[PDB]
Design a protein around this ligand. Sequence first.
Ligand SMILES: CCCCCn1c(=O)[nH]c(=O)c2[nH]c(Cl)nc21
Length: 291
Amino acid sequence: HFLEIDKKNCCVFRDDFIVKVLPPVLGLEFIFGLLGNGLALWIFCFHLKSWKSSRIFLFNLAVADFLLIICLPFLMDNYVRRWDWKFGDIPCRLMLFMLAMNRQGSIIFLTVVAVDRYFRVVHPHHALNKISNRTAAIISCLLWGITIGLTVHLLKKKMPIQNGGANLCSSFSICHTFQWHEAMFLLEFFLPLGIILFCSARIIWSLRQRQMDRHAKIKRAITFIMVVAIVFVICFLPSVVVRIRIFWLLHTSGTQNCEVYRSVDLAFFITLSFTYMNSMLDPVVYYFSSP
Ligand SMILES: CCCCCn1c(=O)[nH]c(=O)c2[nH]c(Cl)nc21
């Protein structure tokens, strides 16, 4: 129950019902993402030779998704052991760093693709619609650097922590403090949420206003950007909602017996796996949309 991490009062929980739902969903997530991302990378690197600016961003998203899917098997192994990391200390920090970095990278590149579509559809005569490959590669490297800059603190903050009779390797704990990590999670949902919603709404409004809904494939494009927004919201909403709920249960009362946390704590991590479904669904909608 109660524990102290870096002079911080936290309430970890190693309960059951975690080795029941999480490993079956994670295994199927891994075995479907492997095939989807392998086909995407095959059609990207080898079978096709044409690099356009939007395709570079799509390839970056695919790389992030593939790395996250590769990282997923270790997560499945961890949750199978009922929260017992049996790998080491360097692999644990590396795994947490990779998880955070490619989650943020997937979100950032999704936002970048949405902004690119917004510029293509609403502002067709802007410069950012005909950039060179050098500028696109520089932007990609800059975004990757921003991600690493935001996650070196996860890379450095701590190692696996002994508790009870086992060891826990986690960064999404619950503690009575508001560090940069949780605020960064809330930002990495909300700000891209606003950007994506604004871009999608403007795209829909401009396409409908300019009398373009008559065209056939444009209707498919509209429905696909709509389902992209919907799936992003569906995949990233339960996690942030449970995080806000546990924050509220933390500020009001808090640091108590902490059993009241557990009823919602199990709700958090399950929904966390739901975010990986996002990584699974992007190949279906993003790359697999050519008529
Ligand atoms: C590799 C074991 C980490 C377990 C806790 N954890 C985390 O610390 N950061 C995460 O991004 C994350 N995602 C999911 Cl699922 N579990 C997570």
